[PDB]
Amino acid sequence: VRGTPVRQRPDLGSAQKGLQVDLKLVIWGTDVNVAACKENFQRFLQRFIDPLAKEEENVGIDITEPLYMQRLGEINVIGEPFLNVNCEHIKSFDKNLYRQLISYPQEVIPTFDMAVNEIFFDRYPDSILEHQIQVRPFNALKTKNMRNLNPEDIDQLITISGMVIRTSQLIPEMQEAFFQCQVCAHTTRVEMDRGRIAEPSVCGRCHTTHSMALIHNRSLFSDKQMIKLQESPEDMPAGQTPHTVILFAHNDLVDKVQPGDRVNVTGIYRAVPIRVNPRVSNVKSVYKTHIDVIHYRKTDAKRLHGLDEEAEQKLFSEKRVELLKELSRKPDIYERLASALAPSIYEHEDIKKGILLQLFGGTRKDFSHTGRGKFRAEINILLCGDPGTSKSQLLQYVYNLVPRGQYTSGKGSSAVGLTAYVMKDPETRQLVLQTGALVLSDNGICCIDEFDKMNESTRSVLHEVMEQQTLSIAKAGIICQLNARTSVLAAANPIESQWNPKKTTIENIQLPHTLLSRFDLIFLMLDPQDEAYDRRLAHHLVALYYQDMAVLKDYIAYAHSTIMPRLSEEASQALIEAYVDMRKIGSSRGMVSAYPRQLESLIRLAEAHAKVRLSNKVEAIDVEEAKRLHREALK
């Protein structure tokens, strides 16, 4: 060690004695040796090359060099002192060290820290990190259900997965109190030690008794963050409601993950007693428990790349980038992806191209200089179709596939419940503002089943978000404006739950024109009585009965990363001409008459298709396809 500071580990827990005992010299209560665990992890660091390291999924990870050594090299070239120690790599290497770490985290981890700092500073003498490297051990063997956890895993590193609900304000807590003598101005720092400070009680200089006063804002504080999180268990017993768990983040992990984000969370399961009343210092026999956090895994093999994941530069290998680019250059890329989306359902090519264009999303642009408000860049789809037509299953599939996906169904909702509401947090007791689905879906998708049965007091909420993406809560709690930039995937039944063919489109839909003009795509899911289609659908469904994702998500991620298509002269003139054409056509009543909103719809759909093709310029093909899809969707 050169002398870099040893900043304490608030998230690991309060310190302890570290009592050791001979049976060589293990830690009391544990089958651990500091020397053995330290040396085993030093071996793991120096010699652990992968059996397989897919460069495509693990960019920057080779199959030749020892794995974590080049990680230490990058932690030398840049200044963040954190090392991602995959617990399953440890499981493959040394099962004993897995047992010791995922039974005794707060003591095995500091030894791992010591070893890493020692090896790193041996390798690089003149490298300077702000403090010691810290090991983030994650991807421990997934416990499925918190409700099926036992009281034997207290302080034992677990992992679960779920979506956030709230990330409350920072809360400082003491780490090194500052004291000054009121009489003689003698100063002293007092380190927080094992959960409580030591008030000096005598001046060190003038020996006055209890003249030492605690100066607050000279002290040292690490931060905190209550992060209320809703679990997504993979085990759902017969009637276990959605479990929700409190997460206390600390100095480095605070405000790294927002509400609505979906995360695996690996962290220390920590029981803490409950005070009987807020002022009495008694406690309760019946503890609470809350997971701590040592790591959030953002990546999911079922979902697509997140927003910050797309934003970060070093996300894709050059080979993967070239694979995506040539896959784009292949002419039938759009129809290949529309076929890929939801493989179960049988050849809804038009609807799937539309849903794909939604998922890619239109181009983002700034109108602050123009002062035209904020131009909604998202896309919105209305699957208007007869009941029992797999529209609801499309809703479920896309909701699962997309991150930042929220879900509503008819009048299982309310205006305040979608916007926001003030309620007291029962752990801090302050009146806090909890978000709704329309704020959790801020940069994602809201899937709304039973969209007709969503009585207009609620669709009043949808109006503002669909026109300008702002959601102004004006209430005795707060008078503020929540961002709600949600793409919408609405599902509507016709009146009387069957598409009468006598009634025309608007007459059958029966929704307000000021709402139906907001959805920039409307699909009339109808069933022609093609017996060939019936036979083929039967064979498809029974086929799945008797019975790629990575490239798809990486493709969409690259598109969002560095594809922001712009209009061309050809595309603009075609857009004007096609808008006039559609206006002339739909001027006939019954059908949805065109609007400047529909001009915006055409522009956005063209931008989305250009994003799909990576053209970096909206083309006549794009605008022609947008026109074609709009017509064939509405017809």
Binding site: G239, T241, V276, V283, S285, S392, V416, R535
Partner: protein, 571 residues
Amino acid sequence: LKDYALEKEKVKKFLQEFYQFKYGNQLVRLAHREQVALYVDLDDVAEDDPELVDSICENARRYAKLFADAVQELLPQYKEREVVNKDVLDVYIEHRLMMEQRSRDPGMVRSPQNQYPAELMRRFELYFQGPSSNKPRVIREVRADSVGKLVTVRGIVTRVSEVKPKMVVATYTCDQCGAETYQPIQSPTFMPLIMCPSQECQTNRSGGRLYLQTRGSRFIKFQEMKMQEHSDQVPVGNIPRSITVLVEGENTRIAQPGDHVSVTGIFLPILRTVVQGLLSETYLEAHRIVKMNKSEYEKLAASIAPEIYGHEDVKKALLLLLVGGVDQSPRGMKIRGNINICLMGDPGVAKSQLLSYIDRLAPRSQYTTGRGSSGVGLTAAVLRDSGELTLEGGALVLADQGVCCIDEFDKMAEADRTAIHEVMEQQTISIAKAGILTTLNARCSILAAANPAALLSRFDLLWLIQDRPDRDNDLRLAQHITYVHQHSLDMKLMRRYIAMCREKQPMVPESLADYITAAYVEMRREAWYTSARTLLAILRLSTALARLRMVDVVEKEDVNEAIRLMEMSKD
């Protein structure tokens, strides 16, 4: 009164000697730590000694302490090998007794309060199961006179908290000495300690300053469950009385909301703390949990509610759902193996009675009429509990895996109608309401009843019952019901056959692909409302009929009977 050293000797000799060594095998298994809980049986103890049994019935808690310590001392001679120390808790107890041996000095005497206590170092738990002679008493009737007495009760569950770690023996460590003191907890609350009575501290005259931690402590699986009188138990006009029950160790996570339970325990008090005296709450400390009375082909279907006549195809489809179509999750998208039936009917054909019988039948069942369960009654809501906004469930989420028998679906509230549409379509319930932001999981199957389009378009079977007056039909039914009043398969056996039938998991054969596609297109032409939902209906009914046959392969007979049922329903 008696001498409890004599009683402990009695039960020690008993546990060693009673029977294959009945209790001996259990004792050696727990000695090796192949079981963590134990259960005394007062029938098995009345096998020899009745006075001890009557005393246990009258002062059960003390004898619980006796039995548990007796087995604790019987432990080590039954121990025969080195156990693998499966828990960090095992590591702690082994380390503790190791250092006690190290600094033993066996001649040296130690105080009456310097020793690792039983409640800490036991690592097993001992409960009971009251005798058959002990009649289960009414929850209302378990009064103050029955405090301390051993008592069994039978009641329905209303709501059950989760498993949070109750403290049993808190462990404190010092700032100077290094010993480890214990605070054995008993009550709902404890004042922490701040000073260490270790004799090194008493010698040093040092500040104790001991700090509690969870590492060396002893937590336990603790739940507080609620229970409710049986509606048959209830007197003429009073509402059903409730009761709080406390669940510990290997009694945890047995009962669940809505499931009938029989709990055997003792009715011990807690401090109440405005009239003088010394008042006290009452909780029943559970010591054996047994769900009972709901959750323990042609002749079979006719056995489904023999008191109803006719509707033979209806009963067959009901049997079919009760077996359940094959649960499928292929390629991520879920094709749930639930079967949804609606019974539209003329006023009065015993459709409500059919729903009630299915409610009494299924291992999970919830019979909800129109407005008794509306809004939160069907959905899930929020309630104060460790006080907290516990989100708990209504009817459907209580019936998360079972059968919701919905009665008079026609006149339900429109929000209830919307929720039921959601659960039939996707077996979830999304909510973004005032204080709730959830997506409940409800894998339920719907049995709607109603009186005469969305119904037709979202279902697997709709059945119109029109009792067209036919003289011979009504004559036979009249004779039948009059005979029923005149004279006034077994349900358990029926449910056992169904329970085994649930788990054969057939997979469709390729030979029937042509047959099923041909039948689908032919039914479509005969229609020309049928669609892919009706395709999935025939296909699910085929899978379920294969399950009823118990063979793992569906055949032509199955699809034939499925089309027979649907034709009968539509016509």
